[PDB]
C-alpha cells in the first residue's frame, strides 16, 4: 500500500513503522504528475544496504562538497552534513553563527546539493576516463541534519522535501524547541513534548511519502542534559517534571534529566523513525549499552545511532585502547551509524591555521611542506596534487572536443604545467 | 579632482595613475546619493599602507570564512581570493568547475562577502570579550579575483562594483578572452588586444570612482604562455603576431608568446592599474627580476604582484635554499603583493583526504589524534580546538543577556561541555 | 547617551523610547570598527520625518523592485514590504508559500535590498540624464514585514540587523509564536506572553542600536481575533485567560479575543516601540478610533498604523463614502502609516490573468491595447512604454562612452527601435 | 541509438537532426548513474506535441511564478521566461540592468525553477480539493531565453543543463557575441560566425543529450539589423562583409545586414535546433513570408518561431486588422511558436504605475476598484481575489490534518476572514 507509494522501496522497508496519516491522504496531497528524486531514491536504498550489511556505518562531517570527495575517495561510505558547520561556516545567510538555528531554514538542503554535485563530477571524470570509478560509487548517501525542524510540523515537513530534492539519503530531527535550539553539548536547551516530536517526525515520513521516496529519519532526543520543557501536558512526560520548581519567566517547565527520560521518548518515537539517536555528556559505552538495551527491550533490533563528538576532550575521557576500539564496540551494540559531527570544521581550521603559521615563519618552505606531503600521499590514492584534473579540466576538455568534432584549438590539459611537471 | 570624489583616498593615492573618464563624468554616474562602503575603503587603505610600508605582504588563497579567520589569526596580513577556488568548490552554481570563467559572475564577490562577515564575527567575539584583539586587525585587506571581468568591460565594471560592497580592498583583471579564460598554468589561453584590456581596467577604476573607494586594480598579463589572440587590431600587438601561420579555425591570431610581449603589455597598463602581474610557466627569480627591471625602468618604482603557484612542482624546479629565500627575494625586486592561489584548494583536500583515509582504518584514533594535535597547537595561538567560542557562542550569550535585562534561562556556554571538558 | 551611539538619530528621536540593555551593552556588542549603513540612516531619518509632517503616509505592499519604482514614481512617499507577498511569489526557496513564515528567514531583507537596488538605478538613471528627478527621492523609506521574529529574540535580532543592511527604514514585529505565525486575516493564530514579545522588540533595539542606525520599530499585535496563547506565564495575559476550556493537545492556553487585550498589549509595547498597530477583522473606524483613544491615554501622540487589508472585503463592509474618507479619517486619530499589505500580488495576479484571456481571444489585439494605455498614461507621468531607457540602457551606453572616451561602437539606443517607433 | 539515451523521446523527434559529436561520446560524457530529470521530460515532450498540432502556440513572457499561474489558468498553453525580463527585475544579482547580459548566468534558469515550483504548488491544491483540474495541465511548457550563451560553447552547455535541471521545455541561443549582446531591438549588435553558432548549438543538444531528455533547441539570428561581426573566418559570412569599410577600433568586422544573411544563417543553424528564429525591426508579414519560404525551400516543414515585440510601437506600425489577424496569418506560415517577450514587464509596470496613481489621488476608493473589478473577472474564471486559497493555505491545512490525524487546533482557513467575507 505504502510499498505502491514509494516504488523504490525495498520489501519490508517500511516493517514496524506506523503513520499517523493514510495512504490516500499521501495521494490527495502529492498533485498530479510524478516527480522522481534519483538520488534520493539511489542514495536511501543504499544507506537502507549499508546499515544492515556493514558491522557499522562510521562517517565525518563535511562542510563543503570537496571535502565529501575526499571522504569518498577515501573509502567511506556515507557522509555527515552537520548543521553546526554549516552555522559555523557554509549557509545561505553567509555568516558564522553559533549553532542556534540562527541561520535561514534552507542553508542545509543547499550544502546537500552542493557535495551531490562535486560527487557527480568525480563520477563524469572517471566515467569519461574510461578506466572505472576508483571507488565503489561517487553517490556516498548523505545523512543530513534537520536540526529542530525550524519551527513546527510544516517547517519540518518543508525541510523533509527540501533534503530529498537535493539527494539527501537520511535527515534527523530533534525534540528541541526550534527557536531556543541549541548543540546537543551546549546548555540551555529545551525539550518539546513527546506528542510534539512524534508530530515532527511524521510530518518528516508525509514529505518522505509524497515526495515517493523512502527517505531515512532519523529521531533524536535531547534529554540527557535538557532541564527544561516547554509543557507538560503529555503524560509520558510528567512524572519527569518537577513541579516543585516551579515554571521559569519564560514559562518553561523543569525536568529530571538523564538516561531515563531518553528511554522513554527513544521507546515512544521508536515507531515515527528508522534510527534513534540519544546525545550524551561524554563518549560512555557503558551508557551506550544502557540505552540500547533498554530500547532493543522494547523494540527488538532497533537501530541506532550516535555522535562521536568532538565537544568531547577524548584523551580526558578515554584510554588509547577504548579510543581504538570504540567505534567498533558501539557497533556490535546495534550503533550502525556513527559520525563525527565537526570533523570537517576541525580539519579545515586546523590544518589552514598550521599552514599559515608555517608560510609566516618560512613562506615557500612552508607551501612545499604541504605539497611533498600531498606527493608522498599519493600512493595511498589522494590524488588532488593533479589539481587541474581533480576539478575536471579533463573532462571540459572531452567536452569541447565532442562538441567541435575533435577541432577545438583551446583545450586546456595538453600544454598545462600540470601535465609538464606533475608526471610519475 | 578625484580625491574630492574619491574622500578617503590618501595622499599621492593616484599618483601616475591616467584615467579614459573625467571627474564630472564620475559625478554624472554616480547617482545623486552618498552611499558609504566603509570595509572598502579601510581594507584599500591598509592594504595601500601595507604594501609601501612591509617588504613585501604575502597571502593565501582562501575558500571559507573560516579559513580567512585563521588566516589572520595566525598573523597574515592580507588575504587573496582565488577563482579558482571559486571554481572547484565556492561558487553560486553549487557545482565543481575546472578554472574556465564557468561560474556565475557574481560567485566571487559572494565569497568576499562571506570572508568579511567571518572576520567581522571574529572581531566582535573579541571585542565583547573586552581583553582586547589578538591581532592587529580582524579586517585583513582582501585582494580578488576577478578573472577577465566576465565578458566586456561593462561586465568588468560591474564585478569590480560587487566586490567593492562586498568590501575588497583589491581586485585583479586579466587579459585573456573570457569565453576561453584559463588558468595561468593551463594551455588554451587567448589573449585579447592591448587596447581591449586597458578598457577593462579603465571599466575597473571608473567603478572604484562612482563607489567613491581607493579600491586597488591589478592589471595580470597571461602573455608569457598564450599563444593565441582574438585580434591584431592594435598596433602594439602586430610584432608579436606570426603572420606566417594564418588564423585558426575559430578565427584568432597566432602569437610569439614569452617575456618579451609580458614587457610590452605592462608597459601599456601601467597607468591604468596600481599593481602588476606577470604570469610565468616556472618560479624563476631571473626571469622576475629582468621582468621588474623592464617595467621598473618605464615606470620607476611601480609595484608588482607575483603568484607563487601552486601549479609548480616546487621541488622539482627549486633546492631547499632558493624555496626558501624566495618570497624575500622577490619582495627586494619590488613585488610587494605575492600569494599562493590555491594554499586552500590544497590543505582542505590534503587535510579532509588524510583523516579520512585515518579513520576509515582506525575510527576515532585518527580523529583523537587531530584534537591532540589541536590542543598542540593552542601554545602557537590556535583556539578553534574550543569550537563553541570559536564561532560566537559567547558572543551570542551575551547579545541574549542584554535583551534580557541579565535574566535569560537558556544560554549556552556556562553548562556546555566545552566548558566542562576544555 | 544613546544619540552618540547612534549619530544619525534627529533630536528627540527616542523620546519615551524605554531599552533592556545599557549603553555599554552597545558598544560591548558592535565590534570594533565602524561601518556605515547608508540608506538605512537615510531612509530612517527621512520616514521619521514623514509620519511627523504628513497629514498620513500611506503605502503600498511591493513584491518586486520595479513594483516599488512605480510606486515611487507615482508620487507615494513610502513602500510596505509585505511578507505575504514574500512567501505568494518572492522567497528564498523559490516556491509559493501560504502565509505561515514558510519561507527561509533571509527571504525578506533579500527582497529589501531588491527594492533599494531598483531604486538606486532609478536614481542614477535620472542624475545622468542630467535634468533632476522627476520625484522628490527615488529613496521612499521602505517599512519592512518582519513577521513574527522567526523564532525567538536572538532570531528577531538577526533579522533586525538584516533589514538594516539591506536599507529598510522600520520593521515590523508581531506578538505570534513564529512556528504557529499566520495572516492577521487567517484563523489558527497563537500569541506569546505580553513579556516573550517585548523581549523581541527589544531584541530589534538592540539590533538598531549595534548598527549604529535610528530605523523605526513598529509592534504589532493578533490579539483581536487568536484565541490561543502559548503560556499563561506573565500576569498581564492571565485575565483574558480561559481557564474553564482548558489546554488545547499542543498544550496552548485558550484565551477571549477582542479589542481589550489588543489595548493592553499594546500600552505594554509602547515604550519599545515607535509605533503601534492592531491587527483587525474588519475595516472599522469606531474600533480604529476606540483604540487610538485607550492608546493615547496612556501614551499621548504614539503614532500609530493601519492595515487598509485586502483580506477584507471593501463593498461588502462600507459604502462608497466610508471607502472614500477611510484613509484620511484614519490619519486624524494619529495612524501616521497606513498600508494596503497584498497591493503588489492582486495587481500583478489580477493584470496578467486579464491580459492573459484577451490573449487567448484576440491575440496581439488584447497586447496592443495595453500598450495604448500605456501611451495614454504618459500624459500622468508613465514612463514604462519605453522600456529600454526605463531600466538604464541609456545609462549603460553612457558608462560605456565614459570608459570608452566616446568611441565605442556598440552603444544601445542611438540604433534602437525605441528611439525609431517611440519619439 | 541517441534514441536509447534519450528514452522520452517520442518517434521521429530527432528527424534531420545533425550531431557534431556521437552516441559514444554522449555515453562517456554522462556518468555513470541515471538521473532523471521529470519537468523537463514531460515539458519538452509536450512542446513538441503543441507544437505539432496547434495552429500555433502563443505565449507571454513571464517575470514571476505567480503571473506564469495566471497565464495557465486563463489558458494559455506555454510559457515564454525573457532574459530581458530576467534583466530589468528578477535576477541573482538583485539589480535592474538593461538586456545585454549583464546578470550572472544563473539567473534564468533560477527562475525557470520559480516557475515550475509555482505551477507544482497550483497543481498540488488542485488535486488536494480532489474535483479535478481547472486546467488540460498546470505544467505548461516553458520556452527559456539562454540569450547568448553566456561566453563560449561550455558556457552554453552549462546554461542548457541547468534549464533541464529548472524544468525547461525548450531553450533559445541567439548568434550574438556574448560579452556585446543585446536585445534584438538595440542597436550596437555584433554577429559572431555563423561556425561559432553552430558549434554553441552543438552544445546545446549535447547537453540535452548527456541530461537523457528531448529539450528543444531553439536557434536564433541576429542578422536583420546587425552591422557587425567578430570575425570574417567562415566562408559562408564573407559575402555579407563590407571589407572596403574596414574593421571597427575594437576589430570588428563591418555587414551588409538584413534578410539574406538571416536566411543563410537560419539555412545553416536548421540541422542543429528544432525551430528558427529572425528578430525584425517590424511586425512585417511580408518580411516573415520571405524568410519562412526561403528556410521552407531548403528545409521543407521547419517549425519557426517569432518574436511578437513589445518593442514595436503596434498601432504606428500596422492597422488593427492585421493587428488581429496577425499571429494566426504567422501560423499559418509555420510559425508555430510566438511570444510576446515583455508581456510581464508592461504589465506588472503599467498596473502598479496606474494603482499607485489612483491610491495617491483617491486612497480607498482606488483599490476598491481592483477589488471589485476582481470579483467581475471570477465570471471569466480569476480566482486570486481569494488570495488565501491562492497561494496554498488550504493545502497546507490539509498537510497539517494529515500529519496530526485531524486534530491540529491551528489550522488557518475556517475561522479566515476569506471564508467569512468572499462567500
Ligand atoms: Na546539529
Ligand atoms: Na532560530
Ligand atoms: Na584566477
Ligand atoms: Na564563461
Ligand atoms: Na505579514
Ligand atoms: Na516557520
Ligand atoms: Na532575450
Ligand atoms: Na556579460
Ligand atoms: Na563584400
Given at each position: 500500500?505504502?510499498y505502491?507509494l514509494?516504488?523504490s522501496?525495498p520489501?519490508?522497508?517500511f516493517?514496524?513503522?506506523?503513520?499517523?496519516?493514510?495512504?490516500?491522504?499521501?495521494?490527495?496531497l502529492?498533485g498530479?504528475?510524478?516527480?522522481?528524486y534519483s538520488?534520493?531514491?539511489?542514495?536511501?536504498?543504499?544507506?537502507?544496504?549499508?546499515?544492515?550489511?556493514?558491522?557499522?556505518v562510521?562517517?565525518?562531517?563535511?562542510?563543503?562538497?570537496?571535502?565529501?570527495?575526499?571522504?569518498?575517495?577515501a573509502?567511506?561510505k556515507?557522509?555527515?552534513?552537520?548543521?553546526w558547520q554549516?552555522a559555523?561556516?557554509?549557509?545561505?545567510?553567509?555568516?558564522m553563527?553559533?549553532?542556534?538555528?540562527?541561520?535561514?531554514?534552507?542553508?542545509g538542503?543547499?550544502?546537500?546539493?552542493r557535495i551531490?554535485?562535486?560527487?557527480?563530477?568525480?563520477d563524469?571524470?572517471?566515467?569519461?576516463?574510461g578506466?572505472?570509478?576508483?571507488?565503489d560509487?561517487?553517490?556516498?548517501?548523505?545523512?543530513?541534519?534537520?536540526?529542530?525542524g525550524?519551527?513546527?510540523?510544516?517547517?519540518?515537513?518543508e525541510?523533509?522535501?527540501?533534503?530529498?530534492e537535493?539527494?539527501?539519503?537520511?535527515?534527523h530531527?530533534?525534540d528541541?524547541?526550534?527557536?531556543?535550539?541549541?548543540?546537543?553539548?551546549?546548555?540551555?536547551?529545551?525539550?518539546?513534548?513527546?506528542?510534539?516530536?512524534?508530530?515532527?517526525?511524521?510530518?518528516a515520513?508525509?514529505?518522505?511519502?509524497?515526495?515517493?521516496?523512502?527517505?531515512?529519519?532519523?529521531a533524536?532526543?535531547d534529554?540527557?542534559?535538557?532541564?527544561?520543557?516547554?509543557?507538560?501536558?503529555?503524560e509520558?512526560?510528567?512524572?519527569?517534571?518537577?513541579?516543585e520548581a516551579?515554571?521559569?519567566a519564560?514559562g518553561f517547565?523543569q525536568?529530571?534529566?538523564?538516561?531515563?527520560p531518553?528511554?522513554?521518548?527513544?521507546?515512544?518515537?521508536?515507531?515515527?523513525?528508522?534510527?534513534?539517536w540519544?546525545?550524551?555528556?561524554?563518549?560512555?559505552?557503558?551508557?551506550?549499552?544502557?540505552?540500547?538495551?533498554?530500547?532493543?527491550?522494547?523494540?527488538?533490533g532497533?537501530?541506532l545511532?550516535?555522535n562521536?563528538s568532538?565537544?568531547?576532550?577524548?584523551?580526558?575521557?578515554?584510554?588509547?585502547?577504548?579510543?581504538?576500539?570504540?567505534?567498533?564496540?558501539?557497533?556490535?551494540?546495534?550503533?550502525?551509524?556513527?559520525?563525527?559531527?565537526?570533523?570537517?570544521?576541525?580539519?579545515?581550521?586546523?590544518?589552514?591555521?598550521?599552514?599559515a603559521?608555517?608560510?609566516?615563519?618560512?613562506?615557500?618552505?612552508?607551501?612545499?611542506?604541504?605539497?611533498?606531503?600531498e606527493?608522498?600521499?599519493?600512493?595511498?590514492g589522494?590524488?588532488?596534487?593533479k589539481?587541474?584534473?581533480?576539478?575536471?579540466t579533463?573532462?571540459?576538455?572531452?567536452?569541447?572536443?565532442?562538441?567541435?568534432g575533435?577541432q577545438?584549438?583551446?583545450?586546456?590539459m595538453?600544454?598545462?604545467?600540470?601535465?609538464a611537471?606533475?608526471?610519475?
Amino acid at each position: 500500500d505504502f510499498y505502491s507509494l514509494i516504488p523504490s522501496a525495498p520489501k519490508g522497508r517500511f516493517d514496524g513503522i506506523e503513520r499517523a496519516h493514510t495512504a490516500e491522504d499521501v495521494k490527495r496531497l502529492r498533485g498530479s504528475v510524478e516527480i522522481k528524486y534519483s538520488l534520493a531514491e539511489m542514495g536511501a536504498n543504499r544507506l537502507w544496504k549499508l546499515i544492515h550489511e556493514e558491522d557499522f556505518v562510521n562517517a565525518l562531517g563535511a562542510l563543503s562538497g570537496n571535502q565529501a570527495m575526499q571522504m569518498v575517495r577515501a573509502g567511506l561510505k556515507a557522509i555527515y552534513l552537520s548543521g553546526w558547520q554549516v552555522a559555523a561556516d557554509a549557509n545561505t545567510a553567509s555568516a558564522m553563527y553559533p549553532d542556534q538555528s540562527l541561520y535561514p531554514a534552507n542553508a542545509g538542503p543547499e550544502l546537500a546539493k552542493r557535495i551531490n554535485r562535486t560527487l557527480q563530477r568525480a563520477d563524469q571524470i572517471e566515467t569519461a576516463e574510461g578506466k572505472g570509478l576508483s571507488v565503489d560509487t561517487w553517490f556516498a548517501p548523505i545523512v543530513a541534519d534537520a536540526e529542530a525542524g525550524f519551527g513546527g510540523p510544516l517547517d519540518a515537513f518543508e525541510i523533509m522535501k527540501a533534503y530529498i530534492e537535493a539527494g539527501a539519503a537520511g535527515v534527523h530531527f530533534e525534540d528541541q524547541l526550534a527557536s531556543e535550539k541549541k548543540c546537543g553539548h551546549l546548555g540551555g536547551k529545551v525539550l518539546i513534548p513527546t506528542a510534539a516530536h512524534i508530530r515532527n517526525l511524521n510530518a518528516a515520513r508525509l514529505a518522505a511519502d509524497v515526495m515517493g521516496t523512502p527517505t531515512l529519519i532519523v529521531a533524536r532526543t535531547d534529554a540527557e542534559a535538557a532541564k527544561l520543557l516547554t509543557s507538560d501536558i503529555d503524560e509520558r512526560d510528567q512524572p519527569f517534571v518537577d513541579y516543585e520548581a516551579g515554571r521559569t519567566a519564560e514559562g518553561f517547565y523543569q525536568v529530571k534529566n538523564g538516561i531515563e527520560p531518553c528511554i522513554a521518548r527513544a521507546i515512544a518515537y521508536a515507531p515515527y523513525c528508522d534510527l534513534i539517536w540519544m546525545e550524551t555528556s561524554k563518549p560512555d559505552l557503558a551508557q551506550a549499552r544502557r540505552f540500547a538495551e533498554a530500547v532493543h527491550k522494547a523494540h527488538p533490533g532497533k537501530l541506532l545511532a550516535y555522535n562521536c563528538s568532538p565537544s568531547f576532550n577524548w584523551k580526558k575521557n578515554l584510554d588509547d585502547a577504548t579510543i581504538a576500539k570504540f567505534q567498533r564496540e558501539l557497533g556490535a551494540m546495534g550503533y550502525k551509524f556513527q559520525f563525527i559531527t565537526l570533523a570537517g570544521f576541525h580539519q579545515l581550521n586546523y590544518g589552514m591555521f598550521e599552514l599559515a603559521r608555517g608560510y609566516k615563519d618560512r613562506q615557500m618552505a612552508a607551501y612545499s611542506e604541504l605539497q611533498q606531503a600531498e606527493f608522498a600521499a599519493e600512493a595511498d590514492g589522494y590524488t588532488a596534487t593533479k589539481h587541474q584534473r581533480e576539478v575536471g579540466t579533463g573532462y571540459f576538455d572531452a567536452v569541447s572536443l565532442a562538441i567541435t568534432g575533435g577541432q577545438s584549438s583551446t583545450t586546456a590539459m595538453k600544454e598545462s604545467t600540470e601535465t609538464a611537471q606533475f608526471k610519475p
